[PDB]
Amino acid sequence: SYMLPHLHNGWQVDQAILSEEDRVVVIRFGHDWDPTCMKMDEVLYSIAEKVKNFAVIYLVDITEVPDFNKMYELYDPCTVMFFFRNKHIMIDLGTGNNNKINWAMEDKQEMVDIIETVYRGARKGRGLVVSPKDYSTKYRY
Amino acid sequence: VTLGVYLTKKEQKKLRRQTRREAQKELQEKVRLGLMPPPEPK
Amino acid sequence: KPLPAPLDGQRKKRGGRRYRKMKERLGLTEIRKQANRMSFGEIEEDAYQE
Amino acid sequence: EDPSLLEWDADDFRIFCGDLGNEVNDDILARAFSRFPSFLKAKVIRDKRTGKTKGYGFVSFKDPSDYVRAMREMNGKYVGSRPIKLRKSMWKDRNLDVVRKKQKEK
Amino acid sequence: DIESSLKQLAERR
RNA sequence: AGCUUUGCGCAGUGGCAGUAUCGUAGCCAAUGAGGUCUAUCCGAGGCGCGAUUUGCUAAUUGAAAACUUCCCAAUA
RNA sequence: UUGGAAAAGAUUAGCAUGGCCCCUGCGCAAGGAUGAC
Numbered sequence: 001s002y003m004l005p006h007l008h009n010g011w012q013v014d015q016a017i018l019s020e021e022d023r024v025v026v027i028r029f030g031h032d033w034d035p036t037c038m039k040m041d042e043v044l045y046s047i048a049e050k051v052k053n054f055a056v057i058y059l060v061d062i063t064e065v066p067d068f069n070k071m072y073e074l075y076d077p078c079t080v081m082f083f084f085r086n087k088h089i090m091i092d093l094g095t096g097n098n099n100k101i102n103w104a105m106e107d108k109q110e111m112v113d114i115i116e117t118v119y120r121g122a123r124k125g126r127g128l129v130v131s132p133k134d135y136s137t138k139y140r141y
Numbered sequence: 142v143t144l145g146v147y148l149t150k151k152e153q154k155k156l157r158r159q160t161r162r163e164a165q166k167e168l169q170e171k172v173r174l175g176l177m178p179p180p181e182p183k
Numbered sequence: 184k185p186l187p188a189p190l191d192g193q194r195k196k197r198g199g200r201r202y203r204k205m206k207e208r209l210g211l212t213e214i215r216k217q218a219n220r221m222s223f224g225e226i227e228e229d230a231y232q233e
Numbered sequence: 234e235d236p237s238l239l240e241w242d243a244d245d246f247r248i249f250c251g252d253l254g255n256e257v258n259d260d261i262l263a264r265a266f267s268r269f270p271s272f273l274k275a276k277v278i279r280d281k282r283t284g285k286t287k288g289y290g291f292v293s294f295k296d297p298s299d300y301v302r303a304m305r306e307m308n309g310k311y312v313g314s315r316p317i318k319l320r321k322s323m324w325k326d327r328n329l330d331v332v333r334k335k336q337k338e339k
Numbered sequence: 340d341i342e343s344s345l346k347q348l349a350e351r352r
Numbered sequence: 353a354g355c356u357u358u359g360c361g362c363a364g365u366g367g368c369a370g371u372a373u374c375g376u377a378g379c380c381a382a383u384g385a386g387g388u389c390u391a392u393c394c395g396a397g398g399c400g401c402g403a404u405u406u407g408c409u410a411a412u413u414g415a416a417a418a419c420u421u422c423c424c425a426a427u428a
Numbered sequence: 429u430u431g432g433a434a435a436a437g438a439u440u441a442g443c444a445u446g447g448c449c450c451c452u453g454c455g456c457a458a459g460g461a462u463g464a465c
Contacts, residue, residue, distance in 0.1 A: 001345055021311070032348045050186045112186075119189045125315070125436060151397095158374060158447075160361080162405090165446065169406075175246040175297025182407070182445040183364075196407065199442040204369060205404080237420040249419055252437055278420045282434040289419050289437095315436035323419045357460060366450070373448055406445055417437055428429050 002032060002041050003048060007058050010065035016058055021085040024055035024119045029062055029069060029100075030078025037078040039104045046108035051115045076102045084122040091118060091129055094136035098128060103135070238324070241274045241293060246300035247322035250277070251289030257313030262290055267303035270295040292319055 007013035007027070017025055028044065030037030044057050051057070062069040074081065079100035082089045090098035091114065105111050114131060121129025133139075172179035206212075241247070250262065250272070263272035277290030294300035309318040 001341070002348070003341060005341075006344065032344075033351050049184065053185050054188055116189050123189065154448090155375075157361090161447080164362085165406080170298075170301065174301035182443095194438090195440080197405085197443095197446095198440085200369090201404080201444090201446085203442085209370060235420065241420085247419090251418065252435085254436060257436080276420090280434090281421055287418085287421090288435090291420065317436080320419090325419085353463065355461085358458095360456090362454075364452080368449075369447085404447070408443080408445100410442085412440060413438080414435090417435080417439090422434070424433070425431060427431100 001045070002059055004028070004041070004044055004057050004059045006032075006060055006064070008061070008064050010067045013058070013060060013065060013068065016056075017083045018086060020056050024051070024115060024122065025083050026055060026057045026080060026115070027068075027083065028057070028059045028078065028080055029072075029074045030060075030076075030080075031062055032059070034077050036104045039106060040078045040080065043105055043108060043111050047112050047115065050112060054119050055115055072099065074100060076100060078102075078104065080105075082118055084118075087122075087127065089118055089122050089129055090127055091131045093131050093133070238326075241291065243274060243293070243295065245270075245273060245293045245295040246297040247275075247324060248292040248294070248300060248304055249289055249320040249322055250275070250292035250317060252315075253277075253286075253288070253290070253317035254313055254315035255286050257315045258290075258317070259286070259313075262312075263292075265303075265307070267307055268294050268296050268299035293322070 007016050013027060017027075019025075026044075028037065028040055030040050032038070032041070041059065044059075048057070060068060062074065068074060072081070079102050081100050082091065088099070091101070092098060093101065095102065101114075105114075110133065114133065117132050118129050168179070171177070253262075258277065262277045263275055265271055271294070272292045273295045275291035275293040277286055278288075279286040279290075294303065304319040307319070309316050
């Protein structure tokens with residue numbers, strides 16, 4: 001499956017980041033073999049037709065284009081990062097850093113809310129968007 | 142020859158609303174662009 | 184099933200017999216008193232009335 | 234007094250271009266081509282001896298109808314690091330204040 | 340289109 | 353010759369404004385949508401969408417809430 | 429007149445505009461009634 005077209009070329013991915021400016025660009029640097037990236041792709045497909053009018057999500061393979069995993073240092077098996085009009089917005093997840101999500105978010109509503117908040121912060125220009133979630137914990141009990 | 146036909150009541154209401162809106166918009170465009178000051182709204 | 188764009192209102196300039204009717208009928212003004220105060224000194228209701 | 238409007242008194246359509254970034258549209262604020270003279274005799278005002286722009290900048294188009302059409306079509310459009318909008322200029326010196334005081338209380 | 344990528348992913352898993 | 357009917361569009365006035373005003377773009381619809389009266393009678397709306405748009409003024413918070421320089425010092 | 433240092437414009441409320449329902453003056457269609465030594 002993986003209906004989201006993965007930008008094979010690194011320069012193609014960079015141009016795609018420079019392609020759209022009025023919406024949210026999310027790149028899934030996870031390798032499609034691992035099950036975690038499969039769950040991330042499933043979550044994206046859940047929000048494929050929802051956040052489409054406000055965002056443009058693309059997949060990525062760190063093996064295909066390695067420059068993204070060597071310059072941005074995306075060492076996680078499946079890290080979700082955002083870039084808005086040549087500005088990598090930071091989501092205030094609270095996991096020590098804000099460059100990636102790094103978690104296999106199995107909740108479609110949580111992903112949709114995060115996308116909406118990221119879009120609102122990008123519109124407001126805040127480079128560090130306050131994520132409306134307590135991602136610092138496992139959020140399970 | 143050149144002859145007309147009847148109209149519709151719903152079409153009449155739509156035409157009246159659209160014509161009033163278009164007249165207001167045309168007046169605003171003509172008197173707000175900067176060619177002639179508009180009067181006070183009465 | 185599209186999703187509405189993350190956009191809000193531009194600015195507020197109208198009010199009174201143009202937007203006040205909706206804010207008085209639909210979003211009608213509640214008591215706004217005797218229901219928001221807590222009286223941090225005393226205790227009106229029971230300890231576990233809730 | 235402020236001897237500034239002497240270089241801009243052209244009976245044109247003047248608009249308020251402000252609430253933008255400090256460096257956004259620093260020198261190309263009039264580079265747009267929505268009309269014939271763009272923002273003629275207009276620039277971005279700034280706070281002197283600080284290297285910073287104080288927001289509002291001059292926006293004066295010599296064509297009134299073209300200015301109105303461009304402002305309506307480009308209200309809050311993407312302008313550099315901060316999309317700014319347009320609104321009617323004040324141009325209210327003391328020659329307007331005297332007449333306003335005369336016509337208000339009388 | 341997506342068929343080739345899906346087949347490639349499946350063949351490695 | 354004066355007036356006037358459906359009244360129309362302009363401009364003024366009065367009132368209404370979430371049930372309403374309208375597009376209704378999805379659908380039926382002058383080739384009948386609907387029924388306790390009227391049933392061999394009546395004959396044009398209804399289901400769902402979305403808002404009630406144009407500007408000015410005061411205030412309000414904030415250090416600043418915006419329209420072309422500024423805080424300073426003996427004089428003129 | 430002379431002289432030294434230099435919130436990416438927001439919240440809240442009314443007023444008219446604006447939307448429709450009524451009338452008026454205007455403009456005129458098709459007509460309706462009448463005066464015509």
